Amino acid sequence: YPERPVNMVVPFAAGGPTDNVARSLAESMRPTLGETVVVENKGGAGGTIGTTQVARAQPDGYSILLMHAGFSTAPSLYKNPGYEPYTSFEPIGLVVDVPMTIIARGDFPPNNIKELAEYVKKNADKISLANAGIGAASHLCGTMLVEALGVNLLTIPYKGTAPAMNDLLGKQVDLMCDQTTNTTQQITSGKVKAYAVTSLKRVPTLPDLPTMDESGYKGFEVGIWHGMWAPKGTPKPVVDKLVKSLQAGLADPKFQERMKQLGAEVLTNEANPEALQAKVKQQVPQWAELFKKAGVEKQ
Ligand SMILES: N[C@@H](CC(=O)O)C(=O)O
């Protein structure tokens, strides 16, 4: 192992934030894996369809999952998300931690986060919020945003924030929370309005955006960690090979440069099964409590 290419499933549309991470990582893992990694995009239901696909795939090491913190929210959002977060997989390791930006279409009237809150409260019924479906990173942040503002908004789900971004750029949807691996490009060129970040400290590549925390939203912190998993029952030597390849992929300079430019923190020393298992163990109950408090129930 591996004696043929390894398929890496990204549960979202090509060209978006997780796809960007996946394609860079696929390249960086190659020298150590000793085979090419082929990215497959499988969007739908906030990432649960793609996650489920890998959960049900042959445990031979030729199907692996690259998925983000939505892996941990979906079990509190769906009566049956299609997988069991603690047992459906053999965890390989953590990958990156990506902050989010609150953005709007380029001609959205407010120019800052204070004015945004005021505008959304006053004009709520005229405003659409985009996300990548229940279970997505943009869904989690969007939920937190409308809760913090005390509003209910028309909410439009997409198979990823790549198609959502298309509509935002096209002025077909108004407001979105999305990861810097997808938004940096559009923010720095001035193509979208940018209001705030969801990190505890400012994003150094986007230094003029205040955190939500410093903007008055105490504890409004969202970091979209990403993990890599194989299906339950994948042989230990195969998991071992995947761990070694992931570690080498994260330690690679080209990968790290691209991640740095996109505002992603590389979790270089946390690319091991135990770290990912611990992350999932902590995160599922954390988001469960958040949704419970927001009155957001399983469906
Ligand atoms: N990470 C997703 C977007 C999201 O979950 O909000 C994507 O790659 O499209």
Ligand 1 proximity of 43 Cβ (cutoff 6 Å): no
Q: How far apart are CA 7 and CA 23, in angstroms?
A: 11
With vertex at residue 114, the alpha carbon angle to CA 110 and CA 117, rounded to the nearest 5 degrees, is 75
Q: What single letter denotes the amino acid at residue 278?
A: A
Q: How far apart are CA 28 and CA 96, in angstroms?
A: 14
Ligand 1 pocket mutation pick from 9, 159, 179, 180 by most atoms within 8 angstroms of CB: 179
Which H helix or E strand runs over 157?
strand 154-157
- Secondary structure letter of residue 40 according to DSSP: E
User: Which domains are assigned to the chain?
Assistant: 1-98+223-299 (3.40.190.150), 99-222 (3.40.190.10)
Q: Which of 96, 167, 184 is nearest to 130 (CA)?
A: 167
User: H-type helices in the chain, by residue range?
Assistant: 17-33, 48-55, 70-73, 113-123, 137-149, 161-169, 180-188, 236-250, 253-261, 273-293
Q: Which atom of ligand 1 is nearest to 159's Cα?
A: 9
Give counts: helices (H), strands (E), the chain. 10, 10
Resolution limit in angstroms? 1.7
- Asked whether the beta carbons of 49 and 11 are under 8 A apart, the reply is yes
What the block records as the tokens of 220 is 């409004």
- Centre of ligand 1 to C-alpha 179, Å, is 8
Q: Phi and psi of 92, rounded to 5°?
A: -100, -55
Q: Which of 17, 71, 42 is nearest to 258 (CA)?
A: 17
10 Å CB burial of residue 111 (0-12, 13-18, 19+) is exposed
Q: Which residues on adjacent β-strands are paired with residue 101? A: 178, 197
Ligand 1 proximity of 138 Cβ (cutoff 6 Å): yes
- Centre of ligand 1 to C-alpha 294, Å, is 22
Query: Experimental technique used?
Result: X-ray
